[PDB]
Each structure stands twice: as C-alpha cells, then as structure tokens.
Design an enzyme around this catalytic site. Structure first.
Site, mmCIF file in Angstrom:
data_model
loop_
_atom_site.group_PDB
_atom_site.id
_atom_site.type_symbol
_atom_site.label_atom_id
_atom_site.label_comp_id
_atom_site.label_asym_id
_atom_site.label_seq_id
_atom_site.Cartn_x
_atom_site.Cartn_y
_atom_site.Cartn_z
ATOM 1 N N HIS A 1 0.583 -1.538 -0.111
ATOM 2 C CA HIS A 1 -0.516 -0.078 0.460
ATOM 3 C C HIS A 1 0.761 1.266 -0.276
ATOM 4 O O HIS A 1 2.020 1.192 0.340
ATOM 5 C CB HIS A 1 -0.992 -0.400 1.365
ATOM 6 N N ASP A 2 0.466 2.040 -0.203
ATOM 7 C CA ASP A 2 1.127 3.801 -1.066
ATOM 8 C C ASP A 2 2.038 3.715 -1.310
ATOM 9 O O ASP A 2 3.402 5.052 -1.028
ATOM 10 C CB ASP A 2 0.782 3.877 0.743
ATOM 11 N N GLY B 1 4.697 -0.474 2.885
ATOM 12 C CA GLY B 1 4.381 0.283 2.647
ATOM 13 C C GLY B 1 4.976 1.384 2.716
ATOM 14 O O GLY B 1 5.768 1.671 3.423
HETATM 15 C C1 U20 Z 1 15.766 -5.471 7.054
HETATM 16 C C2 U20 Z 1 14.790 -4.591 7.158
HETATM 17 C C3 U20 Z 1 13.177 -5.736 7.059
HETATM 18 C C4 U20 Z 1 11.843 -4.933 5.940
HETATM 19 C C5 U20 Z 1 10.796 -6.207 6.208
HETATM 20 C C6 U20 Z 1 10.030 -5.394 5.475
HETATM 21 C C7 U20 Z 1 8.516 -6.508 4.669
HETATM 22 C C8 U20 Z 1 7.188 -6.107 4.592
HETATM 23 C C9 U20 Z 1 6.395 -6.982 3.971
HETATM 24 C C10 U20 Z 1 5.094 -6.278 3.027
HETATM 25 C C11 U20 Z 1 3.957 -5.890 4.320
HETATM 26 C C12 U20 Z 1 3.227 -4.747 3.480
HETATM 27 O O1 U20 Z 1 1.851 -4.739 2.778
HETATM 28 C C13 U20 Z 1 2.213 -4.079 4.647
HETATM 29 C C14 U20 Z 1 3.030 -2.888 5.684
HETATM 30 O O2 U20 Z 1 4.017 -2.821 5.907
HETATM 31 O O3 U20 Z 1 1.925 -2.923 6.389
HETATM 32 C C15 U20 Z 1 2.867 -1.556 7.963
HETATM 33 C C16 U20 Z 1 2.598 0.353 7.651
HETATM 34 O O4 U20 Z 1 3.220 0.671 5.930
HETATM 35 C C17 U20 Z 1 3.070 0.975 8.412
HETATM 36 C C18 U20 Z 1 2.911 1.835 8.313
HETATM 37 O O5 U20 Z 1 2.341 2.187 7.816
HETATM 38 O O6 U20 Z 1 2.126 0.277 9.192
HETATM 39 C C19 U20 Z 1 2.149 -1.149 9.768
HETATM 40 O O7 U20 Z 1 3.734 -1.083 10.944
HETATM 41 P P1 U20 Z 1 3.875 -1.231 12.276
HETATM 42 O O8 U20 Z 1 5.473 -1.727 12.369
HETATM 43 O O9 U20 Z 1 3.725 1.089 11.953
HETATM 44 O O10 U20 Z 1 2.270 -1.684 12.159
HETATM 45 P P2 U20 Z 1 1.763 -1.469 13.983
HETATM 46 O O11 U20 Z 1 2.857 -0.241 14.454
HETATM 47 O O12 U20 Z 1 0.568 -2.120 14.318
HETATM 48 O O13 U20 Z 1 3.016 -2.470 14.556
HETATM 49 C C20 U20 Z 1 2.301 -3.965 13.702
HETATM 50 C C21 U20 Z 1 2.670 -5.548 14.913
HETATM 51 O O14 U20 Z 1 4.164 -5.397 15.558
HETATM 52 C C22 U20 Z 1 3.676 -5.148 17.123
HETATM 53 N N1 U20 Z 1 5.027 -4.361 17.803
HETATM 54 C C23 U20 Z 1 5.446 -3.358 17.051
HETATM 55 C C24 U20 Z 1 6.430 -2.837 17.686
HETATM 56 C C25 U20 Z 1 7.448 -3.156 18.962
HETATM 57 O O15 U20 Z 1 8.259 -2.452 18.903
HETATM 58 N N2 U20 Z 1 6.828 -4.316 19.626
HETATM 59 C C26 U20 Z 1 5.716 -4.933 18.854
HETATM 60 O O16 U20 Z 1 5.713 -6.164 18.951
HETATM 61 C C27 U20 Z 1 2.743 -4.795 16.879
HETATM 62 O O17 U20 Z 1 2.277 -4.801 18.712
HETATM 63 C C28 U20 Z 1 1.782 -5.126 16.541
HETATM 64 O O18 U20 Z 1 1.117 -5.889 16.370
HETATM 65 C C29 U20 Z 1 1.710 -2.390 9.534
HETATM 66 N N3 U20 Z 1 1.491 -3.159 9.517
HETATM 67 C C30 U20 Z 1 0.750 -3.819 10.285
HETATM 68 C C31 U20 Z 1 1.005 -4.949 9.860
HETATM 69 O O19 U20 Z 1 -0.254 -3.411 10.177
#
Ligand code: U20
Ligand code: U20
Ligand code: U20
Ligand code: O5D
Ligand code: O5D
Ligand code: O5D
Lengths: 263, 263, 263
Positions: free
Chosen positions: A125-126, A143
């Site tokens: 997305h985006d 994203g």
């Molecule tokens: C070495 C680099 C490797 C990179 C690997 C990249 C792989 C990407 C695969 C494609 C994903 C893509 O299609 C979608 C995507 O990226 O969405 C996210 C969206 O771009 C983002 C910003 O808008 O927001 C979200 O990511 P965030 O990490 O900011 O989300 P969040 O804060 O909701 O945290 C997601 C989960 O991690 C948990 N979390 C977060 C931080 C932490 O310190 N500990 C933890 O457990 C938290 O409780 C939650 O269950 C979004 N995710 C989710 C699951 O909602």
C-alpha cells in the site's frame, strides 16, 4: 465497457463496469472487478485477479497468479475505496502482488512505465514505483516505499516502510534496506550500507564522463568528507550549479525522512 | 453438507462430503475437498485450494492462490490421513501455504485465531501457531515449529525445524532462527540472537510497569547474570511467585528442545 | 494426442497438439500449451500452467499455482522458441516456476529426475538441475546456474547467475551464493563460504570411509594447503588415481567459470 476488439476468454469473469481497452486480452480464469480499467493492448495471461479501484495502462503483460489492486496488509486499513495506478509496458510476472493504498497514506499505490516486476515481487500500500525499474524475485517493499526511476532491487531483498530507493540505485540481492538510499548509489547488506556509485548503470544510460565524476564527488561529500549532512547540502547544491545531474541529490534530501544508509 | 445460506460460486468445485457453514462464501475457481469443514462466515476469495482432513473456523478470510491442507514437504510423509486445524477470524493472504501434519510429528498442523499470515507465509507440517500472531511476507516455518501467542515474525525470515518462538516475541525481518526464542524477547540476525525485551509490544498489550520490569529482570538473569540456565531456572520461578507474567519463562523452558538463542 | 487412459478435467484447457501420456492426470483449471509433452503417470493437481516447448517425463507430481515452460525473465529474451526438459518422479510444489531457455544461453532449461522443488523455488532460463536434488522454499536460481546430482539448497537461498553448485553439496538456508561450490562441500552465509565436507550426506548415500577421507583430503588441498588452484589440480588428479570419487573435483574444475567460494 469492453472494447469490441478486446478478447475476454469465456472462462474469465469480467464484472459489469470494468473498462477494457482495444486489443486487450483477458485470459482464462482471470477475474476483473467492476472498478478496473485495463488499457489498450494489455494482456492478462491466465489466473490473474484484478480488483479495487485500479487503472492499468497500455501494453502491459501480467502473468498468472498475480494479484493487482487487492486489499493491503496494513492493519489500519478498514476497506476504504483507495486506489492503484499502473502505467504502460510493464512486465508483471507470476505471483506479483500490488496492493491498494490506505487513507492514512494518501490513498494511492502507483507504478509507472517500462518496469520489470519479477516473480513474487511485492508492492505494498501507498508505494510509488517510477519508470524503468526492476524488482527481482521476491523483492518486497513495505508500505509507503518509493522506488525512483531506473532503480533496481536484487532478489530476496526487503525494504522497510517509508524508505526511499533513489534514482539509478542498485540494491544488491539478499539485502535489508532500513534507511533511505540516495540517488546513484550501490547499497547492499543486512542492514544495507553504501558501496559507491552505480557507475556502470550511469554509463549505460548515457551519463557523460563529467556528470559521473560530479556524482562521485557528491558521493564523497556525503560519505567521505566527514561533514554533517546539513553542512554538505549547500556544497552539493553548489556543485549542481555546474552539473545538473547532481540536483537529484538535492531533490532526494527534501523527501528523505529516515536518514541515509551509512557505513 | 452445504448450509442453505452459504454461497458457492458456480465455477468452484466443492466435493460431496465437505461441510460449509452458514453465510460462508466459496469464490470462483476454488477447490474444497470432501474432508474439509469451513465454518460460518468464512470467505474463500477465489482460486483457493483446501483439501485433506482440514477444519477451518469462523469469519476467516482466505485469499487467492493459498493452499490449505495440502500434502506436506517432509520426505517421511507417505500419504497418511493427517490433519489441519485453523481457528477463527484469521486473515490468510495470497499464496500462503499451510500443510497437513505427519504421523511421526503428532498428525496435526494447528493455527489458532486472529492471526495475520501475509503473502507467501509458510506453515509446515506439525507446526503450532497460537493466537494474535503475525507472519510477514515470505516468513517460513520449517516442520514442528511453535509460534506462541502474540509473536510476530518479520518479512523474509525462516525458522529451523522444532524451534519455539515464544509468546510476545518479535523476530526481525531478514533473519534466520536456529534455536528457541524465550517469551517476550526481540530476536534478529542470521543466525538470530537476542536483542532485549519486546517492551513496546508488552506496553501496547496492557502489561503493567511492574510486570515489564520483572520480565526485564528475568531476561537479565538469563542473558546477563552469567549463570547457567539450570542455575537461573529456580531464580526465575522465584520471581514468578510475585510476578505471574514471569511464569511464561518457566513454561517455555519445559518445552524448549534446541537450547536458547545466544549472543 | 491425449492417451485414452489419461484424465483431463472438464475445466482444464489442453490445446490441440499437446501430448498427454497414459494414466496422466490433468486437474481442474490447468492450462497445457500445444507444444507440451506430459509423460505417463504425471499429475497436474489443479491451477497449473504449462506452456512453451516443454517435455515432462513420467510419474511427476506438479502442484497448484506452478508455472512450467513460461517466458523467462532475461531482458535479452525476445520470444524465440526455446525449451524446457523435465525428467521423471519429480515433486514440483506450489508456486514453483521453471522458465524456458534463451538462445544466447543454449536454448534449454533442464531438470533431471527424483528432485524435490519446494514452494516457490525458481529455476531460471538455461539452468541445469541434475537428479535427487532438493531446492527448499523460495530457493532461487539466477540464469545459467548448474545444480549437480544430490545437491541441496536451503530455504530462502539465492544463487548468482552462472554459478555451479557441485554434486552432493549442502547450501545452508538464508545464504547468497556468488561463486562456484565444489562437489561434496557445505556452503553457507552471505556471501556463502565453505564450511567443510558434507560428510553426513556422503555417509547416508553409501560412500566408503576411504572415499570420504580422500574427499576430505582433497578439500584440505584446496582450502588448507595454501597452494594455488593450479598447483592443487594435479595433486587432486593424483589422488583420484586411487580414489575415483575424487575425480568429481577434476570434472568440476573444468566447468567452473566464476572461481570457487573462499574463506
Ligand atoms: C531489514 C528490513 C526488513 C523489512 C521487511 C519488510 C517486509 C514487508 C512486507 C510487506 C508488508 C506490507 O504489505 C504492509 C505493511 O508494511 O504494513 C505496515 C505499514 O506500512 C506501517 C506504516 O503505515 O504500519 C504497520 O506497521 P507498523 O510496524 O508501523 O505497525 P504497528 O505499530 O501496528 O505494529 C505491528 C505489530 O508489531 C507489534 N510491535 C510493534 C512494535 C514493537 O516494538 N513491538 C511489537 O511487538 C505491534 O504490537 C503489532 O502487532 C503496517 N503493518 C501492519 C501489520 O499493520
Ligand atoms: C537459518 C535457518 C534456516 C531455516 C530454513 C527453513 C526452511 C523451511 C522450508 C519449509 C520446509 C517444510 O515444509 C518441510 C520440512 O521442514 O521437512 C523436514 C522436517 O521438518 C524434518 C523433521 O521431521 O525432517 C526433514 O528434514 P531433515 O533435515 O531432518 O531431513 P533428512 O535427515 O531427511 O535430510 C534431508 C536432506 O538433507 C541431506 N543431508 C542431511 C544432513 C546433512 O548433514 N547433509 C545432507 O546432505 C539428506 O541426505 C537429505 O537429502 C524434512 N525435510 C525433508 C526434505 O524431508
Ligand atoms: C548474493 C547473490 C544474490 C543472487 C540473487 C539472484 C536472484 C535471481 C532471480 C531470478 C532471475 C532469473 O529468472 C533471470 C536472470 O537471472 O536474468 C539475467 C541473466 O541470467 C543474465 C545472464 O544472461 O543477464 C541478465 O542479468 P545481467 O545483470 O547480466 O543483466 P544486465 O547487464 O542487462 O543488467 C540488468 C540491469 O542492471 C543494471 N545494472 C547492471 C550493472 C551495474 O553495475 N549497474 C546496473 O545498474 C542494468 O542497467 C540493467 O538494468 C538477466 N537479467 C535481466 C534483468 O535481464
Ligand atoms: C547485481 O545484479 C543485480 C543487482 C540488483 C538488482 C538486479 Cl535486478 C540485478 C540483476 C541480477 C540478474 O538478473 C536477475 C536479478 N539479479 C539479481 O537479483 C541479482 C543480485 C545479485 C547480487 C550479486 C552480488 C555479488 C551481490 N553482492 C549482490 N547481489 N546477483 N543477481
Ligand atoms: C519491526 O517491524 C516488524 C518486526 C517483526 C514482525 C513484523 Cl510483522 C513487523 C511489522 C513490519 C511492518 O508491517 C509489515 C511487516 N513488517 C516487517 O516484516 C518488518 C520487519 C522490519 C525490520 C526492521 C528492522 C530495522 C530490523 N532490524 C528488522 N526487521 N521492518 N518491517
Ligand atoms: C540443514 O538442512 C538443510 C540444508 C540445506 C538444504 C536443505 Cl533441503 C535442508 C533440509 C532442511 C529441512 O527440510 C526443509 C528444508 N530445510 C532447510 O531449508 C533448512 C536449512 C537450514 C539451516 C540450518 C542452519 C543451522 C544453517 N546454518 C543453515 N541452514 N535448516 N533447514
């Protein structure tokens, strides 16, 4: 409306409302949603799903098991009618996924023209993918990632959310990109770090010897001079007064939000 | 039996014997085998294969090109009638594979409820995934892996056979997990090593300041005190007499068979 | 011609000209092009695309969402009628891709017999896979790669173009192979480096204690003696006068074009 010169296989499902251009080809077992536009000459080989508010340009080739326009994977997304735009003459290979935007992110996932998206590449997305880019097998964008013109991303590589892959960058395979990659740079590793200027790409794409040297000098300002980025920005702008290709650095700095990849 | 309120697309193939619950939706070109149960409200978007002895709960969303219940990839498997169980309200994205168990491994692959399994995630034979977990794109579990409640596994990461990913763990992207990860820990690298307590996850999930401190103190016993695990186990049990969240470590130690990830 | 004992599902599309052998099985929503030959007993489960000039042998099992014979991803390819050959008793799992060759590369992609190609493995144009090999989930071969008999490649691993994976090699998961891997060697890392002899594989495959010792001595000549490869080649040929298994090194050196993986 389906153009009279388009081919729709009897087993494909094209929903009323979809717009299919002249000499397009919808192969067997494809599904095309009511808000899809498919441009002239575009081919869906077979087993392709295209849905959402999704506009696809001309002369694209989309291969089997690809999913274009689908609901994204952001837990914040709740079904809002966001969009995908895809340009012309892209080759979109088996199992590629391109997901619709989110309201929070601006509502639009965009891909330009003449791109090669290899097997199982992911455009979240985006994201914004420019022109003449290559994503190799399994290359995965989180994203909000930008991939600028001519950049290439090697097999098995993933890019953390919001990162910018600058123009003419080469990101090696088996890498993880966690910060922004300035234009013209080679990046590789986990996490990826800079490895000089993508000289060979610039040479093949018609850059002059003077432009490449100026770009290399800008790279040294950023990574070798030891100065801070804020000190370096005016010196790069100064160099771009003579070598306009260096302006790409200036434009990139204004967009960068995650800091640059570093040694 | 197919409930009278379920929708089965005319192009889908649902074999006699399959059980389809109320208001479920079987989309075009899906295949559902005779030993499949699909619960109320569950949706198969299109091009989904579900076979084997496979029970799927309510309100799941299963996207195109996913394969659920299929023959596993263990060369020891010889066609025995093993099982898959999937709970409620899971989002199972494009090209995910969830394979049936093996006799040698206990005969059951199990997924709980409220999980997000992103594009091309792999759940091998005899794995156990709990509740509220996330597997990011291409995250791959070998056979017999446990992923406990609330754990998240980043993109491109693979987990070696029999490893335990403890509750509330965060495994970074681009990692390879070769040993067991205790509850509440951040792990990353190839091979993955511990990087502290997943404090931010615990905070968002309602853990008290006292519980998080006690968990951090348990982490230090394991990884900083310099004592052996056998010396540390009673001290952690002692701490859990006051802070019940620390009991998760005790329960994890009893299941661990590959040793803990280490610096 | 379709043998009278073959099964072709009513929803499959087998184009006139395709050759389907006795007791083969073409499942629902498969597509088989006019230049495809499918041998006796081979099964296409469902949702399989096979096209191009592609010959598949007997008793193979090809799972859903696999793409066999498709246009390769080499930008130099322009539609020439190149080929794929696949042998007998292969297990080709969900979403595997095997692409046709290129004129520049010799025109042929070849897979032998008794191989296991796990979910989303990729065999690029002009590759050669031998017999009894395993490619684990997401294992990715670039163009022109050779994978010799009995070699195994772990999950998430990618191999750079033209590299040779020698016979009986074990390449670990999460690795990137950038140079040639001699027979009998364990390789792992990014980039992959040698980690001794795959003794356990040789033991299980019937190698004598004397042969394994001679192979280990050849490994030490290459990697421990400190001599140059040119100095070592005659010493290895000398050892192979007594231990014929060591001749595999000699044959590998003659094919190697990228140099050997190194510490
Ligand atoms: C070495 C680099 C490797 C990179 C690997 C990249 C792989 C990407 C695969 C494609 C994903 C893509 O299609 C979608 C995507 O990226 O969405 C996210 C969206 O771009 C983002 C910003 O808008 O927001 C979200 O990511 P965030 O990490 O900011 O989300 P969040 O804060 O909701 O945290 C997601 C989960 O991690 C948990 N979390 C977060 C931080 C932490 O310190 N500990 C933890 O457990 C938290 O409780 C939650 O269950 C979004 N995710 C989710 C699951 O909602
Ligand atoms: C940094 C970490 C990277 C982790 C990457 C993980 C990727 C996982 C992808 C998903 C796989 C999953 O769907 C299936 C799975 O995990 O199955 C196996 C099953 O969980 C296991 C236990 O029950 O048993 C098997 O694995 P083992 O490694 O124990 O099997 P094996 O002893 O038969 O060896 C398999 C092959 O490796 C060869 N081998 C083994 C050891 C060795 O030292 N050298 C060697 O060549 C051996 O000859 C044989 O060809 C099973 N495999 C096979 C091929 O049968
Ligand atoms: C740690 C190791 C990681 C390995 C990861 C491997 C992942 C492989 C995924 C499967 C790919 C396979 O299906 C197809 C394949 O391998 O094709 C190529 C073909 O085997 C090759 C030889 O015949 O030729 C091509 O690769 P090259 O790298 O030799 O091609 P090229 O010289 O045309 O360069 C490709 C792009 O990189 C740009 N480039 C090249 C070099 C450089 O220094 N900088 C640069 O930007 C160049 O401008 C161009 O856009 C082919 N590619 C393309 C895109 O045409
Ligand atoms: C260098 O080539 C690149 C780099 C980035 C993007 C693209 Cl598209 C390519 C084209 C190649 C070949 O065409 C298929 C896709 N390719 C790859 O993904 C790729 C990456 C590597 C590689 C090699 C080394 C030694 C290192 N250190 C890192 N990565 N080898 N092949
Ligand atoms: C940290 O976020 C995680 C971690 C584990 C699991 C999940 Cl689900 C997520 C959510 C994110 C975003 O939502 C899509 C899936 N995501 C990812 O896979 C992911 C991993 C990384 C990453 C970043 C860094 C700097 C390092 N050192 C390691 N990994 N960045 N994004
Ligand atoms: C070692 O097992 C290998 C190695 C190569 C190929 C294959 Cl086929 C296998 C079989 C296993 C199990 O059967 C599914 C596929 N497997 C894997 O891909 C795989 C790789 C690793 C691994 C573990 C460690 C500690 C390291 N350092 C590197 N890689 N663990 N599992």
């Amino acid at each position: 409306m389906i153009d009279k010169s388009a081919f729709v296989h009897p087993t494909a499902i094209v929903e009323e409302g979809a717009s299919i251009g002249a000499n397009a080809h919808i192969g067997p077992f494809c599904i095309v949603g009511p808000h899809v536009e498919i441009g002239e000459g575009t081919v869906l080989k077979s087993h392709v799903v295209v849905n959402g508010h999704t506009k696809i340009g001309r002369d694209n080739e989309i291969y089997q098991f690809a999913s274009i326009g689908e609901v994204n994977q952001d837990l914040k997304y709740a079904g809002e009618p966001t969009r995908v735009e895809i340009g012309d003459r892209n080759r979109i290979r088996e199992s590629v996924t391109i997901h619709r935007g989110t309201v929070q992110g601006g509502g639009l996932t965009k891909v330009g023209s003449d791109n090669l998206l290899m097997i199982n590449a992911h455009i979240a997305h985006d994201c914004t993918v420019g022109n003449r880019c290559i994503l190799a097998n399994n290359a995965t964008l989180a994203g909000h990632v930008s991939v600028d013109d001519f950049a290439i991303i090697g097999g098995m590589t993933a890019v953390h959310q919001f990162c910018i892959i600058g123009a003419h960058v080469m990101v090696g395979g088996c890498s993880g990109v966690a910060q922004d990659v300035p234009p013209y740079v080679i990046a590789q590793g986990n996490h990826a770090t800079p490895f000089g200027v993508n000289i060979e790409g610039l040479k093949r794409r018609g850059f002059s010897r003077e432009a490449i040297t100026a770009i290399r000098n800008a790279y040294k300002l950023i990574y070798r001079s030891g100065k801070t980025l804020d000190e370096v920005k005016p010196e790069i702008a100064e160099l771009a007064e003579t070598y306009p290709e260096v302006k790409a650095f200036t434009d990139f700095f204004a967009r960068s939000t995650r800091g640059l990849i570093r040694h």
